[PDB]
Structure 1
């Protein structure tokens, strides 16, 4: 293997990593500048449910970045370093028969390699499994390959070797049993009970736990010391009778701004600058298209435009094309948006309720029905913004704008594609999409 295990049975607490991503004790002793290697532990001052229904859980969080010296603008992204569910970590230690509180270091057998450890060391297995390792996504075939040797029941070792192989049936089994069934490492250990790998080897095989990004839902002109997040919690039942939970969203959902014994809920974070930005001149009109959580950056945009108007500045038309399933189920920021509309901050609030009728009604349907005014605004130099689903929504919306320009612009499709692409090059058509 790549690393050798060195158990530290009597190490000083001050020398042990407890979840920090960079320098030892950086989470506890916070000093600017804060960035990816030195994230700021922001206190969660607000964590509230946005949706009216109970089908899903959509939440709004406000992270206190006071005294961090962190600067951000609406449109930027905030990254958070999450922690795995403690109950899941406990189950892994139990099924493996391992003492999770053992502190150790995994050191590269190649003493010349720049990669001295697989994650911050020395640290305990509990800490590694909680903050440094991905224990929820389906293990890659290579992991299964190395794990097979530790399954003492021949049939189980055979199963693991088969799914890790390049055989025809092996690939289909891996696809169905691991990937599609969304079996995480614990699920595999439970379903192949003879599998008993040493915990240190497992820690060398698993991928690192990654930061998750969110579109900041606040304007720094209004909340210079707070970064807001709008997110939908990931939680689903698998085809293997299990309930899988998204790591970052369930971790955030559990962040209690209070917590007995006091204790403020802290979220390690940093800001990643984007090119998604409101027009330099407040008088320039904006067309925002963001269904679902895609409305996130636009809550900040509108907050900013409203603030500017409140200051006494002249602000151009500000239009929002939002969408949700049902008005009384998942209409995010319904109250806030209604107020922005009533006060004049939001010139138009066009909402597509996709499941309030037998057929689908999406934002692009509303865009097309507003083709005349949108063309006028576009010809006038308006900026278009699209945020949300990159799979279908973004493409469907782009095609709708193609058609609008093609029709109202009295030009051929190709000429319309060129027209829109020139808007993108000139920074007048921006996208912030994800899968």
Structure 2
């Protein structure tokens, strides 16, 4: 069906499409949608995947039509999966889009190579096609504060919409709920969702194919502490994927659906005076929408807060606003309402009291005790619980029936004096081997060993960034066993101290001894007065690396995307520049060209 038609039949004039993988763009597109009403308009949001964007040329059939795109960027400046189709259409079309009015707010991250490439492309492309831009491209940077970037952009978008179409601010800034509660006092267990995603009993009754809507419940066969310290916890997990038909290659990611901490869930129900065990269903008031429920329903509040809702990340400002109405104490309600301001003391207190203090929902309800919202409203405001991604640490050629994970457990004390715990890592940490099921699925990536086994590989991955390389080395050794010629295999690893967080020390030492690992160069950053990192070791090896590089070797960089990846790339620029005799700007082009040839791959996060 045509989305243009859908709009006509439902009285909508504004449509906001979201390109989203972890729900942020979606929630953004939703907030925009509910906003239409405050300016004499009717909006709806949509998943472009469910429609045909070629229908865009029919928008003029609706008076005052306005389309907005909230797009996030992924792997190498690529579109999220639900926008892939739209992308492909944008590239092969030359359709005349005169008369179409648009606005684009891109969700991206500066620490990545191709920053906000999706939004930039969509925005640049609609114009080339003939459409009319009504408001500047929004560049949301998640390395800074995406939320503020977004509210700053919205605050300027609406006025520009008002001006252009000749509409006005009703000022009816009141509150509206998307869903209505329905208690299920009389229900069977076979009818109640218990944390599974997609269809009911999908966890209990496992049938392929397994994906993000149908996760395969893998058994934890191994789960061992990797480091000797006790200040931190680094672990190696082995999830048994036998009988799942699931396939993967070293370089691919493994995603998992965690559960929130039991206690935190109880502290929540207890402070809200809510019987967490009540089964219920929240139903969408707009009987036209596909999204009938904010999460699988019916289901108990307990199940909802443990498996479907994010209760740990600092809430976005729109969530702090709606809650403000359930705070009786004047000064406590003052605080919460103000934090929604774009700037002034509102942005200040928001960034400081919420974000920097890393205050989760329970922390808020705690430091503003007069605040007492109903639990069902909260369930509609909170974001969905996302799966977490990990770089598979196994080679499917050695471990076809197992998927390995190397992770560091997140736990830190906040300025608010609280102890915060990462959701998936603590959860994975409590899974006992030899009972203990992890819901997971494999996501393909372009991170891959060279096509030819003889091509040399330069791997750089300190800390948990060593994960995909453990698989690479396993595979490379296995390739030598199959009696094939294997090029040089170098791993530039790093950690703080050799007697603390040296991950896989034995396994890596054995590999080098067996000859599979051509070289093992490790940088201990805290064993001497000053810092010693991987980019230092790369510098010292300037000669051999230039040789391998000019020879056609493949470079791989995995781990921290904030500083490490950037410093390592600057070191590689310096190598090419100093030894290629060319200029630094030329070295930069050189390294960028390698990325496009598939010979300089990145697997970084933060």
TM-score (norm: length of structure 1): 0.97
In the other structure, the counterpart of 1:36 is 212
| SS of the residue 2:339 aligns to | helix
Q: Matched residues in 2 for 1:152 and 1:29: separation?
A: 47
Structure number with greater CO (CA < 8 Å, separation at least 6) is: 1
Give the SS at the match of 2:555: strand
Matched residues in 2 for 1:416 and 1:375: separation? 12
Match of 2:437 in 1: 266
Partner of 1:240: helix, strand, or coil? coil
Give the superposition deviation at 1:126: 0.3
Give 1:309 shift.
Answer: 1.2
For residues 199-246 of structure 1, the C-alpha deviation after alignment (integer angstroms, 9 at most, x for no partner) is 000000000000110000000000000000001000000001100001
Q: Separation in 1 of the partners of 2:291 and 2:596?
A: 40
CA shift for structure 1 position 158: 1.9
Q: Which residue of the other structure, out of 532, 550, 566, is the alignment partner of 1:395? A: 566
Shift of 1:163: 2.2
Q: State the Cα deviation string for residues 85-125 of structure 1 (Å, max 9, x = none).
A: 01110110001000001001000011011111100101110
More off after superposition, 235-244 vs 143-152:
143-152
Offset at residue 311 of structure 1 (A)? 2.2
Note the alpha carbon deviations across 1:34-79, whole angstroms, 9 max, x for none.
1111010000110100111112111100000000010000000001
Cα distance between partner residues in 2 of 1:70 and 1:373: 39
Q: Which one is further off, 171-180 or 218-227?
A: 171-180
Question: When the two structures are superposed, what TM-score results if normalisation uses the length of structure 2?
Answer: 0.70
Q: Which piece of structure 1 moves more, 105-114 or 149-158?
A: 149-158
Q: For residues 331 and 325 of structure 1, what CA distance do their matches in structure 2 show?
A: 8
1:164 Cα shift? 3.0
Structure-2 change in CA distance of 1:167 and 1:313 (3 Å): closer
Structure 1 residue 166, shift from structure 2 partner: 4.0
Q: Does 1:404 align with 2:575?
A: yes
**Is 1:382 aligned with 2:542?**
no
How far, CA to CA, are the matches of 1:7 and 1:155 in structure 2? 34
Which deviates more from structure 2 when the two are superposed, residues 218-227 or residues 400-409? 400-409
Alignment partner of 2:428 out of 248, 252, 256: 252
- For the residues of structure 1 that align with 2:248 and 2:568, how far apart are their CA atoms? 28
| Cα distance in 1, alignment partners of residues 191 and 398 from structure 2 | 41
State the 1:256 CA deviation. Answer: 1.1
Instruction: Output one character per residue of 1:380-419: Cα deviation in whole Å (capped at 9) or x when no partner.
Output: 1111101111111111111111111111111111221222
Deviations 1:278-337 (A, max 9, x none): 011111110000011000000000000111112222211100000000001100001100
Q: Secondary structure at the match of 2:359?
A: coil
Q: Distance in 2 between matches of 1:166 and 1:381?
A: 50
Shift of 1:167: 5.6
CA shift, 1:129, in A, is 0.2
User: Aligned to 2:404, what secondary structure does the other structure show?
Assistant: strand
SS of residue in 2 equivalent to 1:164: coil
Which stretches in structure 1 are left out of the alignment for 5+ residues?
258-262
